[PDB]
């Protein structure tokens, strides 16, 4: 619940960055201009976030 | 490379890797070659030859 005995920091490794992430960003497109909605594998895709 | 390490004062990468800051920045931004590893054992056994 709210039992936080300690808080530590470390140096992330390739594997740690991937484990935190739910999906990989393949393309730079941010939004579709016509539908005003996120694009596939973009910087806002629902598939990723 | 992480910017915080090779550019910070002290540069942690420079300290751990026993390299001068100028050499580290030259290597990082593709300025000059560096000898990573050499077959020193074969060099020694073949010093005569």
């Amino acid at each position: 619940v709210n039992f936080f005995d300690e808080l530590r920091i470390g140096l992330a490794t390739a594997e740690d960055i991937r484990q935190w992430s739910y999906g990989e960003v393949k393309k730079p497109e941010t939004i579709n201009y016509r539908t005003l909605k996120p694009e596939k594998d973009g910087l806002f895709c629902e598939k990723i976030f | 490379t992480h910017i915080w390490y090779f550019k910070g004062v002290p540069s942690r990468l420079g300290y751990l890797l026993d390299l001068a800051p100028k050499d580290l920045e030259k290597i990082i931004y593709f300025a000059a070659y560096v000898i990573t590893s050499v077959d020193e054992e074969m060099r020694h056994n073949e010093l005569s030859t």
């Binding site: - | 490379t1 002290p10 990468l13 300290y15 751990l16 890797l17 026993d18 290597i27 990082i28 593709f30 300025a31 000059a32 070659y33 560096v34 000898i35 990573t36 590893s37 050499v38 077959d39 074969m42 060099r43």
Partner: protein, 49 residues
């Protein structure tokens, strides 16, 4: 081009640091710090920490 392998870029640093062993250089630097040479002793102490 048969014994020494050299390259330029962050990949070279990654390979060199992976090959580099912390324990051996740590022992060597502990031995060095066991000596004097005050001029070099400050740099040796920083690298040792």
């Amino acid at each position: 081009g048969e014994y020494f392998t050299g390259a330029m870029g962050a990949e070279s640093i990654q390979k060199l640091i992976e090959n580099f062993d912390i324990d051996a250089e740590a022992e060597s630097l502990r031995d060095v710090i066991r000596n004097g040479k005050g001029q070099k002793k400050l740099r040796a102490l920083k690298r040792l920490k």
